[PDB]
Amino acid sequence: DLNTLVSELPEIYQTIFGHPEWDGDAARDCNQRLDLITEQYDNLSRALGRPLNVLDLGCAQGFFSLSLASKGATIVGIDFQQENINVCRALAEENPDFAAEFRVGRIEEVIAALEEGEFDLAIGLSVFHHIVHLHGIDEVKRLLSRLADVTQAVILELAVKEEPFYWGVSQPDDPRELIEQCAFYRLIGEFDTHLSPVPRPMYLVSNHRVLINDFNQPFQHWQNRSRRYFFGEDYVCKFFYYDMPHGILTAEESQRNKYELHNEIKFLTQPPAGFDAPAVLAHGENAQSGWLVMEKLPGRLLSDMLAAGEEIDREKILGSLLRSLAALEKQGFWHDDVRPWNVMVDARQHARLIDFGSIVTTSWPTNLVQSFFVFVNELFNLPQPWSNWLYAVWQEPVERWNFVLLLALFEKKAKLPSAEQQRGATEQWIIAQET
Amino acid sequence: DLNTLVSELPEIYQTIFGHPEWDGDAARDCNQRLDLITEQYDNLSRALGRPLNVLDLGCAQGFFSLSLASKGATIVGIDFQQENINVCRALAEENPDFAAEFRVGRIEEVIAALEEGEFDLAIGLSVFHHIVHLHGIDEVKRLLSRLADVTQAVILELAVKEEPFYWGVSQPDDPRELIEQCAFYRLIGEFDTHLSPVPRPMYLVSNHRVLINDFNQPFQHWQNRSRRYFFGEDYVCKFFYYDMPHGILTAEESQRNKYELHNEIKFLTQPPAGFDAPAVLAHGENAQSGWLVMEKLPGRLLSDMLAAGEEIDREKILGSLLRSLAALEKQGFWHDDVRPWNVMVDARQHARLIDFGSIVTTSWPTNLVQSFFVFVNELFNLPQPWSNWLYAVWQEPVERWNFVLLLALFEKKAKLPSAEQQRGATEQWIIAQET
Amino acid sequence: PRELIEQCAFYRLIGEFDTHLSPVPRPMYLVSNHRVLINDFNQPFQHWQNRSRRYFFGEDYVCKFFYYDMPHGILTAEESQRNKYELHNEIKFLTQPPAGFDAPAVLAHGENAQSGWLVMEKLPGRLLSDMLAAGEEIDREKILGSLLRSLAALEKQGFWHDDVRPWNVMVDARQHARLIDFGSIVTTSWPTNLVQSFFVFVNELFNLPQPWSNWLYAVWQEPVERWNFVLLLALFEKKAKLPSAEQQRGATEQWIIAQET
C-alpha cells in the first residue's frame, strides 16, 4: 500500500507524484525545478526529433522521473535508499503506460557503467554534494565529466558552500569547479531549498552540444579562459562569461567582456556596406554570460601560423587586411585591436579580422595607425620596400594619418624613396621600442 | 517580573503560558503537540479513573506542564537551565491552584531516582537527542527503558538524523532504536520543528499497558520481529508493524503483514457458521501498523510443546484440527499455513488454529492437503494406521482431495488396508523429501 | 593489470613484451568503448552487456566474446575449459547447422589462449528471462510450440540442447521463440534427462493448468525408452484431447517436477 511506503520514507523529500495529500509534507514542492526541466527536455527532444532516454541520479521519490515519463520519456531512476525506490515502483505501477524503471544503486557505480548513447539527458539534482562530502572534489569532477561524455545534456542542481550547514565546509569554493572541465555549461536558474535562504544554482551542461534556447546543435570541437569557442559543421559559437568563478574576472573585466560582445552583436547584425562580415545565426546575453553564433570562416588564425612557423605571404596578408581596414574607415569604422590572434588567413593567403568586439565608431586615428606599425613588425626587422612604406607615413603631417592613406602608400611602396638613404631614421627605433 | 525573566531566557523555545505577547517570538507554538498530548492525557486519565501525575523532562518554559496542570494534572517539570525554571515558577505563581512543581536538574539523574508509581505519564519532547549527543545510544536506551518501567505511559518527540545539523550525525539510524527495547510503542504524530523541513516523530510508549485509542488496558506479559503479542487478563493484543526500522521489512513483507492482518480482522468479525473463532474486542490499522485485540485462548502453542518435548496426543490434536479444517472447508474457507506455530493445544489435548491471516476463500485444494501431510510428518516417521491413512489419500484421484475427505479417511484409518503390504510406496518418499 | 581496464567495454590481450628489466613480460592490451576490434571484424557497436562472457550489439550483429583467462579467482580450471568447449562447440554447430533448423548466420569467429569470439547476425526480440522478470505479457502456447518444434527438428537430425532455460530463449514480436545459446548443443536412457528438465522449464514458464497438466501426465505414462522430443511435441499438439490428469490417481509426477524447480 502506498500510505505505508510513504510513511516509511526517512524523508518525504519531494512531492509524491499524483498524490497531493502529501504536498504539505514534502520538503520541496518541485514545481519550479520541474517547469525548467520540462522546457529543457522539450528543447532537446525537439532537436533530436524524438522522445528522450532520461537518467535521474538520486531520484528520491521519483517525481521528476514520473513527470518526464508522463510526457513520453523513457526514464531510469537511481537511488541508494530502498525506501525511496519502493515508493518509485509503487507510483510507476499506478501509471503502467509510463516507461519508467527504478534501481537501488550508487551513483558512482552507475556512472562507471554507463554507455554513451544509452541516455540522452541525465539529471543530478542536489545529490553530488553528498559524493563530494565522501569522495572529494577530483573524483566528483571525473564522475561529472564521464556523465557529460556519455549523454547529450546534463542538468545539475548543486549545493554551495554558502549554505549554513557543517557539510558546506567540504564544498568547492564555487560550484562551477565541479563542471568547468566540461565543454559547455550555462546557468539556467536558481532554486530555494527550504533549508536556508541560500539558493542552489541549476546548470545545463554538455560535452557534445551547444544548448542555447534558440540554437541546439552538436559541435565537433571546442577551445578557449572566460571565452569559449564551439565549432560545428558550419558555425562557430562564441561564448562569453561575464560571471566567472573565483578571482578570475575583475568588475572591469566582466564589463569589458559584456561590452565587447554586445558590440560584436551590434556590428554584425548591421554591418557596414563595403565590408564582408560573417553572418549571425543566433545571439543572446544574460546576467552571467552572452553568446554569438556565426557562420564559420575557413583558414587558420595568424598567431598559430606564426607560432607553428608555417609559411606566410605577408604581401597578401597585409594588403587584404589593409583593404578591409580602409573600407571600414570609409564607413566610419575602426578596429581597436588588430593583432595576429584576431586575424584569420584563408588558403589563398587572404586575411580577415575575426574579433569585432573591438570595433569603434568614434588625433583620430593616429594611435591605431601607430600600433598597426607594430603589428607589421611582429608579422616580421623590415626589409625594403616595407621600411620605405613606413618612412613615407612618418613624413606625413599627423592629421593625415589614417587607413586610406596607409593602404594607398602600401600599394605604391615599390615606388617610394629608399628609407635607408635618408637621416632617416628615428621611426625605426620608435616602433621597435614599443613591440 | 515576568518581562525580565523572559528576556533572560537564552531562547524563547515555547509559547509563554497565558502570555500571548510572546507567541510571535516563540520558536515553537506548541498547539499541535499540545492537542495530541491532551488527548492522550484524557485517555489514560479516563482509564485510570483519576487525574494523572505527570513528569515533564526538559520542560523548558513550562508550557505543556502548565497546560496539563490546568486540566487538573499534578505535574513536575525538570530542566537543567536555571533561566527556564525561573520562568516556569513565575508562571505557576500566576496560577496558584495548578498543582505544579519545577526543579533545576539533569534528566539522567532524575530518571535514576524515579520510583515506580510516582508518575503515571512522562513526556520527553525534543530533549533526548542532547543526551544521545553526549552519552551515546546505549545509555539513552537504558534511560528510556527505566522511564517506561516506572510510569504507565511515555510520550516522546524524537529528533532524527535526517535533520540537516551537525548533531544529526550522532543520532541512531532510526529513532525507533531508542525505544524498540520497550514493550509497546505506536507513532501518534509527526511535527514541524521550524528548524528545517524534516518533522520529528512523536511516539507513545509503555512497558505496562496497551495504549490504543479504543482499548487501554494493562498487560502482564508480551512476546515477539514485526509482530508483537500482549497478554492481559482475558485478552491477547496482536500488534503488526507495517513500517519497520532499517532493512527489516521489504515492500513485499510490509504488504503481507498488512494483508494478513486486514484479513484476520475480516474473518474474525464475520466468522463462518460452524466454526468457533475467538471474539474480537478491538481493531484498527494505520500507515505504520495495525492491531487486533481478541479474547485469549487457553493452552500452549504446539511448536512449544514439541520443542520443549512435552507430552502430546496426536490423535486428539489431529482429529480436532481436521474437524475444524473440514467445517471451514464446507463454508468455503481454507487455511494456507497450517504449522505447529499456528496451532494451540488446550489441556484436553484439543487443538485450534490461531493465525487467521492466512485464511483464504478461493486443482484446489490439493496443495494444502499436500502440506498437511508434511504437517503430519513434522508432528511425528509414520506408524500404522497413520501411514495407511496417507496411503488411502494417495490412491484418490486428485480432484477428490480435500479436507472433508482427509477427515473422513482419518476417522476410519484403523480399517484402511495396510500401506506396507502394497508396492506401495512412493508417497512416503515424496512427503519425506519436502519436510 | 586487467583491473585497470575491465570497466572498459572491449579489451583483448594482443601480445606480451620483454622489458629488459627482468624476466617478467608486460601484457599489451587493445581496448575500446566504441568498437569491436577483432583482426577480422572491426565495427562500431552501439551497446554491450554481460562476467566472463560479453555481448556487443551493432547494427546487424551480436559479437559474443568469451574469456577463458580471467583475472583473480574468477574462473576455475574447470570453468575456463567449459567456456572454451562451449564456444568451440557453438562455432562448430553454427558453421555447419543441421538441415531443417534455422540458425543465426556466422559473420566471424576465432579463439586464442585467453579468449574466443563469435560474431553472428543479430536476432530480433527479447530474452524470455527478461520478459518474465520485467513481468511483460507472454503467449505460452506460441512460445512452447515454436520451441518444441525446433527441439523436435533438432532431434530428428541427431541434435539436442543440454540447457533449455528462459535465459537461452528469445521471443520475437509474434511470440515465436528460438534458442540462442548453442554451446550446449550435443550430438550423443537418452534423452530422458533433457525431457525431464524441460518439464521444469515448463513449470518455471508458469502451477500447471489443464491442458498443460494433461500433457505432462500423458508423457509420464509412456515407457521411458519412448521419451524424446518428437513425442513431447506430438503430445503437446494434441494436449486438448488428452484425458484429464486430475481425474486419475494421478498424481506423483506433479510433485516430482515441483520438487526439482
Ligand SMILES: C[S@@+](CC[C@H](N)C(=O)[O-])C[C@H]1O[C@@H](n2cnc3c(N)ncnc32)[C@H](O)[C@@H]1O
Ligand atoms: C537531497 S536529495 C535530492 C533528491 C532529488 N534528486 C531531488 O532533488 O528532488 C538526495 C537524494 O540522493 C540519494 N543519494 C544520495 N547519495 C547517493 C548515491 N551516492 N547514490 C545514489 N543515491 C544517492 C538520497 O537517497 C536522496 O534521495
Ligand SMILES: C[S@@+](CC[C@H](N)C(=O)[O-])C[C@H]1O[C@@H](n2cnc3c(N)ncnc32)[C@H](O)[C@@H]1O
Ligand atoms: C529543544 S528543547 C525542548 C523543550 C520542551 N521539551 C519542548 O519540546 O517544548 C530541549 C530542552 O531540554 C533542556 N535540557 C536539555 N538537556 C537536558 C538535560 N540533560 N537535563 C535537563 N534538561 C535538559 C534544555 O534546557 C531545553 O529546555
Ligand SMILES: O=c1cc(N2CCOCC2)oc2c(-c3ccccc3)cccc12
Ligand atoms: O570563423 C572562425 C573560424 C575559426 N577557425 C575555423 C577552423 O578551426 C580553427 C578556427 O576560428 C574562429 C575563431 C577562433 C577562436 C579560437 C581559435 C581559433 C579561431 C574566432 C572567431 C571565428 C572563427
Ligand SMILES: O=c1cc(N2CCOCC2)oc2c(-c3ccccc3)cccc12
Ligand atoms: O489466544 C492466544 C493465547 C496464547 N497463549 C495464551 C497463554 O500465553 C501463551 C500464549 O497465545 C496466542 C498467540 C500466541 C502468540 C505468541 C506465542 C504464543 C501464542 C497468538 C494468538 C492468540 C493467542
Ligand SMILES: O=c1cc(N2CCOCC2)oc2c(-c3ccccc3)cccc12
Ligand atoms: O541475437 C541476439 C539478439 C539479442 N538481443 C537483441 C536486442 O538486444 C537485446 C538482445 O541478444 C542476444 C543474446 C543476448 C545476450 C545477452 C542479453 C540478451 C541477449 C545472445 C545471443 C544472441 C542475441
Ligand SMILES: [Cl-]
Ligand atoms: Cl549537489
Ligand SMILES: [Cl-]
Ligand atoms: Cl530528541
Ligand SMILES: [Cl-]
Ligand atoms: Cl550543521
